[model samples]
Target: RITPKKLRELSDLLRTHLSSAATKQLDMGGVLSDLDTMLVALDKAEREVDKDQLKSFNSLILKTYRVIEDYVKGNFMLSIVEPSLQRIQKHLDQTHSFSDIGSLVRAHKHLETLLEVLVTLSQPVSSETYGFLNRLAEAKITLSQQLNTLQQQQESAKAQLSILINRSGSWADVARQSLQRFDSTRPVVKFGTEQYTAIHRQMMAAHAAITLQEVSEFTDDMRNFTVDSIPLLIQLGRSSLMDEHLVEQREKLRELTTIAERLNRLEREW
Candidate 1:
């Protein structure tokens, strides 16, 4: 139960210190691991804390929270990280602009140290300090908004890919079904002897095509459902809403597949 005023002061102090730390800690060549932990902790905390206190601090903590998560999860595309790191590097490069030696002096000195660390790190860090991390943790806000955007792009791309795959495969499925169904009906058409040979030949061709296409579509669908879509949904999930939707989708797909397979087998036997 921290009081409001005290929390405010601490939050502000943390906010400033962490911003500086993001630049300075890297001067030591060792802040990466520690900083990452702090970011994660802050991200978790930010989710549970009040908005007012979080606002008192800067928004960078949230950014740090996301970058750390991206890095850890191995989902961070270098294209995103590189530009962000370059911006931090540019900021660190401007440390000499401040002439005041008061409250800003410590920060300036730390910034210089962080430049050294950045050189060691071979890139700019997500943040220069760790103090704001506590505030970030208290708030549960994260840099994850970036992650959300990136993942959405990926999802959209995946969806388009799925559509393309389906479009190409659709004809294959139709051809197979048409052939299989015809073949299945051939045995029942034994009464007409003269026209029977032509339909019989057609049935054989269709059976071969159905076997090829049905197996192709089924295997592709199986992999898409199990390997691609489910895992992607899992990655996007952190809420009960997501969980509920996923469970529903899984059940529906399962039921649908059962019916589909039975129908396919029926036609296949013919």
Candidate 2:
């Protein structure tokens, strides 16, 4: 019962409403994209739809990556290099000239901290910046290792000095005692009437010669010791380190070497 004109007006209204909804959906999509961008950022590769226009953005990002690397390397220098080098220099400078074995030993014990630091320092830095720093640490480790080796040398030097000092006073007396055992065991041939068996006589003579020869060899060893040991003790004492043992020990070795000379001469007579 509706007229044609009225029907046409109704159809036009329906078409207009549908078009308005489509336009609003398009606007709503813009709003949703704004929210999307706000929620989580996309990487440059994903976000830069127009590379021709986004050079500034891309370059800024590139610049920041370099800046961040610089920051980490700078931090590495300040945190790892500065303190590690400072600790090494201070410890080494003072310890190179020590007061005594105890003093030196204490100094060496403290090196362990530096040693550990250097170990960390030498570890990879994740980039070229740390390579030079690691090289420095490697050199530092070498220096500390050298110091460690020298400490061992010093200990070995002390042993020779100790043995010489302790036994110097009585070694000749013991040498004389050793000769007596062979001397007393000889056959007592009477002044005019006894026939000493050639066999027994030869055997006793051989024993005495062997004992005397042993004494001679011992003296040679004692004398040879000073060639390496005495000079080192002198150098140590003269340096004024507080190894009180050195003062007496050095003078004692001097005398012992002389005593060995006398013992050396005693052998040819036997």
Candidate 3:
């Protein structure tokens, strides 16, 4: 009775070990092959064991355990691997600074490496890495959006600057020409349009002059643009990347203000 019960205990122990190896998904070929004799020995026994047969059975069981041990240990090293939350946090500290597309890509790689490492290791609390990853994802989205806004401001301000530089030139041309035309054509219209209209129809006279308000609105064009773009420039300065636009536009605005003073001169003459 005692010998058979001991045999049953060893059989159950082998069954448990085999279950663990299969569940763990370890390399099965060698472990199962080495354990084949033990199963054969268990098959021969029927709630009983001979002294020599039980001795050989114990040797086979020990060999089977050895085979499975080496197989599992072969899969992993004695040295344990780990990740550092503090190390990942260091990069997170510079999340705001990662405004450019290039730096943002580097941040992306850090999270990517972290994701792969988390997947590879089988630890007690895998959710811990997920906490960091979630934060990284949110940071990436915000920075990408911020960069897009900077680009929007950047492109829009350049367009406004282009117009600011040229609109003044345009006003000067029309304002100067209008004055020249008024001075040159005054003597003809001074005679009065009714008589001069008939005489010029036969010989030469002034054409109908365009209105004061029409030419006048073009000056107001500069002031309207000034109001429109300065607030945009304030928002543009709030960004870190693509900063060349800020200085470029500020200088343009300085030049524009000088031209505004000249427009002041022209309006004073009026």
Candidate 4:
């Protein structure tokens, strides 16, 4: 059995040897120079005539070797791993801006590259490194989903805006035709009427022609149609169609065209 005093002496010897090895940057340099020295001491002790006493010392030497090995391994990993994590964290810090979709896309690329680097660095993957990698993976997934949604929204907006543009032309033609008919309308009295009755008939016909149901419908068509449609068109335009139709028109029509034109102009900001 190893005596307590001999165990303490062996422990002190190992500690001194490791301290010297660290000072000389030897074992940390991947050459276990100090471990070789300890083995030499063990060899000398083993060769002695007191075999049982040397047996105890030999076991203590083996334990020292294990302790030193673990220390060197931890130090080596720290030298490489700490700086790598810091670099990846710094990149993540810079990606905070979500101002535009393109910028978000670029940030997603940077994060992807960083995540790949983490995979490579994850050799022998410790719990700490694994935790960080999981966090990055989650963040990348969220970004990918956001990019897909923005892309789809932009495409949808573009298609809707194209339809709106085409519809504007068609709707304008319809309005012009209706207005022409309205302008040409004139009152006509009933035939075979007596003189006094004919005058009353003429006045009644004039009022009906000018104040027809078609006139009121057209008025409501321009006003109510614009009021309802402009908001939907403008909302779609926010996605990617900000620079298309921009023609001015009369008040009710202008309200519709102004929003369309404004959406087109807003695309410049992106």
Candidate 5:
């Protein structure tokens, strides 16, 4: 039977080897795959020698699994989510700096593509990335609704302008309507002659006034969204990702690697 002390020594050696392998950036998947066969061999040895000798190695495997799991999560956040957020943040800055609506439109389109990538990568609502993405969804919905409202108003104004254009087509010699005077039984009150040109000009002016109001409101809404809402969204995302929670988790993974290496050495030579 393998002595407990010898088993400890073997475990230590295994840990040393694992640590050295890790330092070299070996294929982790292949290493884990190899660990499977090693476990089987360790199990057989334990049965033939001492059943409890390899128990520590099983513990090592569990720790290693946790390490890898945490590693993947952290890596995904840094490699995929972090950089994506950075790019989106840059775009948000661009959006806020935009002087014209056309520039905003182009920036919005590009931002949308980046958001699509985040959506797919985010997944299942449990991932930390989704926390900030939820904020993005809210911002996008509000902005889109505001834009849609403005667009509807624009279309309606255009339709009204079209009607005015048609109505103004014919010039009237006298555009005044006559009304009966309240104090005169047989007298009618007539206003100044309204030429077609004057009536058309008046209608055009009214339409222009309404169009200006709508355009001003639209510009204000766009400015508010770009300046206030977008910056808040980007800040929220940045704050969420910058939280040290993931950093701690990464450290935990590194700690596990050292532990796993130690346990591996114990399981060997037993």
Candidate 6:
């Protein structure tokens, strides 16, 4: 946010410094020894530049340049001046001649604009925030599930206690008669060693790299295979814990899970 007054003043100061330097160089023409001695002394001075010095130096080149330019255009006689006068004027008029500070000024303004835009945009909701919210929801669900399970277990225990109490009393005969009425009605499915072996061979063949037709045919084959295979595997798993067929099916499912995880990872940025 450089004011017009400030920029003009700075430009003028810079021009004045350059004009004075050029004037000194002009004045010392043919006095080589004297000029060398003067330069040596000027260099040895080693002036310490603080903020005020920096401002003064900047003013000398920037602010003084405008004043010098005005003075030159009106007062400095170009017809009588040396050919080098044109070069001096060009240097003085160049915006970047003095420390390239004009570029820095432009950069500062651009930076300010960028910051303003970012401020307007504000902060976005991060993944960490979403993760925390999801975790809270999962905690609520898990707590409810645990409470439900505990309640069901408590009810079952109470019913069993009631049955035991009734058996110890005069209602023991009635309880035994009721228990007899609840006969083994539900059908059970079990798989022995031979049954498991046969199913394992079938599952391996079903999942083998048997190439179907490409595109449409391949897609239909995969879809039908999933529908036909998954439900049957689940049923067989229920019947036998040591079923090799179910184990092979589970291995295939694991492969699918790994591939799905990789694809999911690729789709997200963070």
Cα deviation in Å at residue 112, candidate 4? Answer: 0.9
Top-TM-score structure, candidate number: 4
Clashes of each: 22, 1, 0, 3, 8, 22
Model 2 segments more than 4 A misplaced: 1-129, 171-231, 234-237, 255-270
What does candidate 4 score on TM? 0.37
Model 6 RMSD vs true structure: 33.5
Candidate 2, residues 14-40: lDDT per residue as tens digits?
344334434542222222222122112
- Each candidate structure's TM-score, on Cα atoms with residue i matched to residue i, is 0.24, 0.33, 0.35, 0.37, 0.27, 0.17
Please list the residue runs of candidate 4 whose C-alpha ends up more than 4 Å from where it truly belongs after superposition: 1-99, 173-221, 232-256, 259-270
Candidate 3 vs 6: which has more lDDT: 3
Candidate 3 lDDT: 0.49
Pairs clashing within candidate 3: none
Candidate lDDT scores, in order, read 0.40, 0.47, 0.49, 0.48, 0.40, 0.34
Overall local distance difference test of candidate 1: 0.40
Comparing 1 and 2 on lDDT, the stronger one = 2
| Candidate number that wins on TM-score, 1 or 4 | 4
Local error of candidate 5 at residue 126 (angstroms): 5.9
